[PDB]
Amino acid sequence: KGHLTRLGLEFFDQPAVPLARAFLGQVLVRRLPNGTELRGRIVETEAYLGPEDEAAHSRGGRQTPRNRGMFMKPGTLYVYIIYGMYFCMNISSQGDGACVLLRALEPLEGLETMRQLRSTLSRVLKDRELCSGPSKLCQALAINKSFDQRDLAQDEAVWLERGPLEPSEPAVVAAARVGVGHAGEWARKPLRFYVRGSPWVSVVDRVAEQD
DNA sequence: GACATGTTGCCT
DNA sequence: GGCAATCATGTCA
Ligand code: NA
């Protein structure tokens, strides 16, 4: 572990699909103002191909003030507000307009602070409820629009770390993305990836699992 | 401007 | 499953 050991920019410079899959198993680290560090192992991701992808904010190569991050160098964060109250953390991948979306993390360190963050934002929250969602994880790790357009490879507040080796590569399920019905043909492209059997994924795809 | 629309969690 | 919530943001003009 350690900031010094964060994945560099040669890691993020890959096409959306390979990048999205390569993210699985890595560890997202967040350093809080009090110095505490929050860690979550990435278990769910989504690829957004860009220009072509009709689900991507960059369909038609349309670059707007909001999505600049997607057109910035790989590793560039793109955090946007959805439903006027939630955040979505994306990492720009190779290809102007392409990026990866984080949908779920396996809480590894700072669970209480995450619980605190998620609860304040009754009924007590269980760990399964901390980062099991694109917007849940953003609240749990105190990620917001202020992180938009920063560099995941060079930032003192957030970085990615190599996950542990693992004596059997994790089985990955490729499924349709969540909440992209408005994308016609692209709505069903298997551009969503997660760790098979993981109890931290936000949405399972029984069908996709038996494919 | 005027108008349309993109996750979480309560509801029965 | 159905749906309210809450509003930033993009398009049209
Ligand atoms: Na990109």
What's the total number of domains in chain A? Answer: 1
- Phi and psi of A3, rounded to 5°? -55, -45
Burial of A119 (C-beta count, 10 Å sphere; 0-12/13-18/19+): middle
| Whole-number distance in Å between A130 CA and B3 C1' | 36
Which residue places its CA closest to the C1' of nucleotide C4?
Answer: A83
Say which experimental method was used. X-ray
Rounded Cα distance between A88 and A46, Å, is: 12
**Structural domain that includes position A188:** 1-211
* Spatial CB neighbours of A130, under 8 Å, sequence gap ≥ 6: A105, A107, A111, A114, A115, A118, A136, A137, A140
Nearest partner of A190 among A178, A204, A202, A176, judged by Cα: A176
Rounded Cα distance between A67 and A56, Å, is: 10
Return the amino acid letter for A112.
Answer: E
CATH of the domain at A57: 3.10.300.10
A196 CB neighbours strand C below 7 A: no
Rounded Cα distance between A56 and A47, Å, is: 9
Cβ-based contacts with strand B at under 7 Å: A 82-84, 86, 88, 103, 118, 123, 129, 133-137, 178-179, 182, 202
Residue with tokens 């298997």: A190
Rounded Cα distance between A68 and A79, Å, is: 10
A62 CB neighbours strand C below 7 A: yes
Number of H-type helices and E-type strands within chain A: 5, 8
Tokens of A24: 């699985």
Nearest partner of A109 among A154, A145, A140, A136, judged by Cα: A140
Residue A135 · residue A144 · CB < 8 Å: no
| Whole-number distance in Å between A101 CA and C11 C1' | 25
| Whole-number distance in Å between A57 CA and B10 C1' | 29
Using a 7 Å CB cutoff, list residues 124-183 of A near strand C. Answer: 145
Resolution of the model in angstroms: 2.4
Please tell me whether residue A135 adopts helix, strand or coil conformation: helix
